[PDB]
Amino acid sequence: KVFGRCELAAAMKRHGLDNYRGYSLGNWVCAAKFESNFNTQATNRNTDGSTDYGILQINSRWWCNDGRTPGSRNLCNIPCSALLSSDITASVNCAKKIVSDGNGMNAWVAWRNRCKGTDVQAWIRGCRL
Ligand SMILES: [Cl-]
Ligand code: NA
Numbered sequence: 001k002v003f004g005r006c007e008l009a010a011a012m013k014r015h016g017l018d019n020y021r022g023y024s025l026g027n028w029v030c031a032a033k034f035e036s037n038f039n040t041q042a043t044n045r046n047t048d049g050s051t052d053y054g055i056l057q058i059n060s061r062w063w064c065n066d067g068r069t070p071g072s073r074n075l076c077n078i079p080c081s082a083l084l085s086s087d088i089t090a091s092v093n094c095a096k097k098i099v100s101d102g103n104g105m106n107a108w109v110a111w112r113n114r115c116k117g118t119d120v121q122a123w124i125r126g127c128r129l
Helices: 005-014 025-036 080-084 089-099 109-114 120-124
Strands: 043-045 051-053
Touching: 005 025, 005 120, 025 109, 025 120, 051 080, 080 089
Parallel strands: none
Antiparallel strands: 043 051
C-alpha cells in the first residue's frame, strides 16, 4: 500500500509512535517518506546481502528473518514479509525495538541525513490527528 502523508501520520499516532522515546510524529513520517516513499512493499538489497523491508526499510541482518541472510539475527522475531503488509502493526512494533536499542532514530540513514535538524513538524502540518 502507498500511504498518503496524513493517512500515515494518523495510523502511526494510533500505533503509539507520537513522542515514542521522545520522537515527535513528524520524525517518523519524515523517515518513512525518505526510506520507502510511503510504500509498504518497498524492498532494497544491500551490498552485504541483507535486504531492507517495508515502510521503514527494516534490515534482515538484525531485525527480521528472510531465510537468505546467513548468520543474521531476528531480533523482532518476525518474517521480513510481515513488514510489507498494508497493516503497519509489525513495522511499528519492530521500529519501537530499534529506536530503544541505544542509537535512537540514527539507525535510519535517511532520518539522520534528511530529517534530523530539520523542521519535522512540517510533515504533519494540515493533518487532522
Ligand atoms: Cl534518543
Ligand atoms: Na535475519
